[PDB]
Write a protein that binds this ligand. Structure first.
Ligand SMILES: *[C@@H]1O[C@H](CO)[C@@H](O)[C@H](O)[C@H]1NC(C)=O
Ligand SMILES: *[C@@H]1O[C@H](CO)[C@@H](O)[C@H](O)[C@H]1NC(C)=O
Ligand SMILES: *[C@@H]1O[C@H](CO)[C@@H](O)[C@H](O)[C@H]1NC(C)=O
Ligand SMILES: *[C@@H]1O[C@H](CO)[C@@H](O)[C@H](O)[C@H]1NC(C)=O
Ligand SMILES: *[C@@H]1O[C@H](CO)[C@@H](O)[C@H](O)[C@H]1NC(C)=O
Ligand SMILES: *[C@@H]1O[C@H](CO)[C@@H](O)[C@H](O)[C@H]1NC(C)=O
Lengths: 99, 98, 49, 365, 215, 49, 98, 50, 33
């Protein structure tokens, strides 16, 4: 609304500093994920054999048959958490559909 | 068992739902619909109602931003603890008890 | 003797909930930890005392 | 202009929002043809007394409120829920004209929330009175040299008057503890007394004619509209619409929403209108908002180059307008996609980074 | 003539008597409204007729399980002796007659004012439910006809007419040519659940028990 | 008062947010008191010697 | 020696006393008493005065809740440090310096 | 106001009429007819949990 | 913490399931301990 926007122009820089704070939080989330996971300097890949002293590592090493290269326990952890936000592309395309 | 990871999603979803449902409150104005206010009243009488609605919605947005800042600080502390555990437990043997 | 701060804040709707663990239970936990430390060193943390 | 500076460093900056502007203006009103008889109400000879106030329902007509100044010599309206200048646009469901005669000092009694003898025993208005009050001096019509005793008013009652209640019953008032047995006398008061109206009296005791227009501003099917002209219907286009006095801007589409036959408007969680019923041809329309999104500018430093790229957030490229690459974060325009992978320089979205490399151009990888 | 008499009994209202609070469509949302509703699990009265005047008491929930063309309508008001404004609602044949104009009339029909409201009649194992209320000088009537004793199912009542009468109503009676159920409404807060088609399929009476208060 | 309560209902759901925040603070305090002390599995006790 | 726990008790008591003492403020109205406002003024003016008092007391209560949230974050950090000290130094011998 | 009235022992000086709390809420009054001193307390209340 | 209505007190001592206050926990008849 143009009248509302003209009234909101007189209220200052709260409407911009809230965006600044949320942008800082959004940068900090990627910083947190990078700091937690991106600790190794090189991507070491496992040898094709799976005999490590008689220890069975097949439940935590990635399964190459899956399209998403995750482990069995990792897939269990992804399936046991129900995300409420899975779609980020064509969200307006899903909204314009008659539901 | 996965309580905290579900709690993160639940907190974000209920914060966004509360922020959306704050748009229905009149905040002391004659209506919560801006187009209804503009089509019902004239300009000078509509200024006060639009000002009250703007003040209420801005206060709700500031409350949401403050809650998100505190929650982000808590999440950053937990992420620092997780990075310390990844650096010490995984990349070596730790003699710290429990 | 007149009115005090705790009754003023109680009458105005500000209450203070009791803690879940009482001081007797907190002292029981500290006594258990102290007795385990004295009688077993650090082994009770790792496994059986 | 967003950064309020003449130097822009390297990175991505969210700047503004693109929005599809409305193209055409749609005005829709039901095709009613009658004219509302405000002339019979305002241009009347003898108004009724305040204890027997007239109430005429006006419906199924086109209402033009600009002729009331010619109909009555009143100085101005007193409108509470609406504005008297804006009354010619919005369409009402029902309108009720109440009519009575009081004196001048009790006009402040007839208002939402006010009390007094008339507001407590003769005519009570609701707290949420969305209407107008018109009061004009009538010293040349309702005043008499010998005293006009035709107008009567209520004094005593056993309880206060509920809003919009006509107390027409005329029995004795038992002021005392003894039963009056319907006979007036000591502590047996007749509750109706006459106004004394004389031309020699002051402005406080002079007769005033009052007409109160109460609007039933509701979501019910409206039948008292303004003189505005209805236009044609336009679907699948961002238009600025006015449906029965309800203004808005959006895209109107055909919807299979199962409204009950008594329902007209569909609401949302945010108390905003999502679906409407067309009053001329009884069709059901969904109102989506026009297309919008977020705009980010991905640039190197202004010391390096003045070439930028634009990221539309959450927008499919096939619907981009108000090279071209498609990301999970939206549509990227102005950055060449390279199959090679380098370190991240400017983060964009789900594993996409843009930089200024090789003449020289912004690449995304 | 005083041929008509009736006896009384008490029974449970269960979860019946929930109407649409407004004519505004809402789909797949829980809405917390606050209006004159029949309280859940209340004490409704079963009248068996083969006749004093009943009190209104802020709206009336009416129900019947009899055959068609038995109850000829209702009468509302204060004295009902052609003295004060008595609302006569005669629902018979192919035209309902609703009038504020009082008329001297007996308890049993056979076989000053001029307001004559006319509309379509309020007619058609089967259960007929009505809700009458008077708010701010407006008489509001809700109705529902359903195939099925008050059942354990949940049904919604739809509004029919609005009557800007403005009189004060404290008493009422019904009209005949068997048995009926009479309820009473109270100002309560309800939590209504809308399905995908916008039909009220479930509701919670907030002031019934602490579990519903928590809900 | 009642009119104050009606205008407070018009202002929306600020009070529910404040009550939820204070409830979360209280539950977090109980969790801290549990976490600091309730680390031992069994309640040990000292011998008479 | 007990100044930290004494400061915790004094901070909570001072915050509650400030929240109580905020009730006597006029906040731009004619009085700080709702009963006095309702007895003196009528409905239309009393709605404006009550609206001013509601806005002021809501702002004060939001400030109290925000301060309690920040103090809760600080106390939770101290409690996590105390739990780490109990896990490492009571239940074992720590080689971390100081 | 709404509350419980109690016979009190507060020593009003004879020129005084009311006695107030910290938050400027009246909690002691003088009866205008019999000149007693009455404490005013709020009625019984409390939180409800399920 | 207050007055508990609808929960029968038991002389046993279980783990805490629904906390109340000051070392009182209720669990499902609904018992408190
Ligand atoms: C280890 O155990 C898992 C059990 O899930 C089995 O599938 C896998 O084949 C085993 N690997 C070896 C090398 O025995
Ligand atoms: C009112 O009605 C009379 C009847 O003839 C007419 O002469 C007059 O013009 C009308 N209008 C006014 C404003 O008096
Ligand atoms: C009003 O419009 C509807 C649909 O546009 C049409 O069916 C009807 O005949 C119209 N009535 C008149 C009087 O023009
Ligand atoms: C845009 O939307 C259409 C809708 O069918 C879809 O087919 C297309 O793949 C989308 N564009 C991209 C780049 O995915
Ligand atoms: C209704 O009330 C009567 C007495 O007033 C009582 O005998 C009867 O059991 C009650 N019925 C219900 C269902 O509460
Ligand atoms: C809505 O009505 C349609 C009509 O056939 C039905 O198929 C559908 O199941 C209904 N939706 C519900 C009951 O949620």
């Amino acid at each position: 609304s143009t009248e509302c926007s003209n009234l909101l122009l007189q209220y200052g820089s709260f409407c911009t500093q809230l965006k600044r704070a949320l942008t800082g939080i959004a940068v900090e989330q990627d910083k947190n994920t990078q700091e937690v996971f991106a600790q190794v300097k090189q991507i070491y890949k496992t040898p094709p054999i799976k005999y490590f002293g008689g220890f069975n590592f097949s439940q935590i090493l990635p399964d190459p048959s899956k399209p998403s290269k995750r482990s069995f326990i990792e897939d269990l952890l992804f399936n046991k958490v129900t995300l409420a936000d899975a779609g980020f592309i064509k969200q307006y395309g899903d909204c314009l559909g008659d539901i | 068992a996965l309580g905290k990871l579900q709690d993160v999603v639940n907190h974000n979803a209920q914060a966004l739902n509360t922020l959306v449902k704050q748009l229905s409150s009149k905040f002391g104005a004659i209506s919560s619909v801006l187009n209804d206010i503009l089509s019902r009243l004239d300009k000078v009488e509509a200024e006060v109602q639009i000002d009250r609605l703007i003040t209420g919605r801005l206060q709700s947005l500031q409350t949401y931003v403050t809650q998100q800042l505190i929650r982000a600080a808590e999440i950053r502390a937990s992420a620092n603890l997780a990075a310390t555990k990844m650096s010490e437990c995984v990349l070596g043997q730790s003699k710290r008890v429990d | 003797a007149a009115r005090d701060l705790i009754c003023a804040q109680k009458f105005n709707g500000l209450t203070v909930l009791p803690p879940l663990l009482t001081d007797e239970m907190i002292a029981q936990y500290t006594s258990a930890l102290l007795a385990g430390t004295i009688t077993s060193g650090w082994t009770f943390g790792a496994g059986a005392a | 202009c967003t950064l309020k500076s003449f130097t822009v460093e390297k990175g991505i900056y969210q700047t503004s929002n693109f929005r599809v502007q409305p193209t055409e203006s749609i005005v829709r009103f039901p095709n009613i043809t009658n004219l509302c008889p405000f002339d019979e109400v305002f241009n009347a000879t003898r108004f009724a007394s305040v204890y027997a106030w007239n109430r005429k329902r006006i419906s199924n007509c086109v209402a033009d409120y600009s002729v009331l100044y010619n109909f009555a010599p009143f100085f101005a309206f007193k409108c509470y829920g609406v504005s008297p200048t804006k009354l010619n646009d919005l369409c009402f469901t029902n309108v009720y004209a109440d009519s009575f005669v009081i004196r001048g000092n009790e006009v402040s009694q007839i208002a939402p929330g006010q009390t007094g003898n008339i507001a407590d025993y003769n005519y009570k208005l609701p707290d949420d009175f969305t209407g107008c009050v018109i009061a004009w001096n009538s010293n040349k019509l309702d005043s008499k040299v010998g005293g006009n005793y035709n107008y009567l008013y209520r004094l005593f009652r056993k309880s206060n008057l509920k809003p919009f209640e006509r107390d027409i019953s005329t029995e004795i008032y038992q002021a005392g503890n003894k039963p009056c047995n319907g006979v007036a006398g000591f502590n047996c008061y007749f509750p109706l007394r006459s106004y004394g109206f004389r031309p020699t009296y002051g402005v406080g005791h002079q007769p005033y004619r009052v007409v109160v227009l109460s609007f039933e501003l509701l979501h019910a099917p409206a039948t008292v509209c303004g003189p505005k002209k209805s236009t044609n219907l336009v679907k699948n286009k961002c238009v600025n619409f006015n449906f029965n006095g309800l203004t808005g801007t959006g895209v109107l589409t055909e919807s299979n929403k199962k409204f009950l036959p008594f329902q007209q408007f569909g609401r949302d969680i945010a108390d905003t209108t999502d679906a409407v019923r067309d009053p001329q041809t009884l069709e059901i329309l969904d109102i989506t908002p026009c297309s919008f999104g977020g705009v980010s500018v991905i640039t190197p430093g202004t010391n390096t180059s003045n070439q930028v790229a634009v990221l539309y957030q959450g927008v499919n490229c096939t619907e981009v307008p108000v090279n071209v690459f498609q990301t999970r974060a939206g549509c990227l325009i102005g950055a060449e996609y390279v199959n090679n992978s380098y370190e991240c320089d400017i983060p964009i979205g789900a594993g996409i980074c843009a930089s200024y490399q090789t003449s020289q151009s912004i690449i995304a990888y | 003539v005083n041929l008509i008499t009736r006896t009384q009994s008490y029974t449970n209202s269960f979860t019946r008597g929930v109407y649409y609070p407004d004519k505004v469509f809402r789909s797949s949302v829980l809405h917390s409204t606050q209006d004159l509703f029949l309280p859940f699990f209340s004490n409704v009265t079963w009248f068996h007729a083969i006749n004093p005047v009943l009190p209104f008491n802020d709206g009336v929930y009416f129900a019947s399980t009899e055959k068609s063309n038995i109850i000829r309508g209702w009468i509302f008001g204060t004295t009902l002796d052609s003295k004060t404004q008595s609302l006569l609602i005669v629902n018979n044949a192919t035209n309902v007659v609703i009038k504020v104009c009082e008329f001297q009339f007996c308890n049993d029909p056979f076989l000053n004012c001029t307001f004559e409201y006319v509309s379509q009649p309020f007619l058609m194992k089967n259960l007929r439910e009505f809700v009458f209320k008077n708010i701010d000088g407006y008489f509001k009537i809700y109705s529902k006809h359903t195939p099925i004793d008050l059942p354990q199912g949940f049904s919604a009542l739809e509004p029919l007419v609005d009557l800007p009468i403005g009189i004060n109503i404290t008493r009422f009676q019904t009209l005949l040519a068997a048995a009926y159920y009479v309820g009473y409404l109270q100002p309560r807060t309800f939590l209504l659940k809308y399905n995908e088609n916008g039909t009220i399929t479930d509701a919670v009476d907030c002031a019934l028990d602490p579990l519903s208060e928590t809900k």
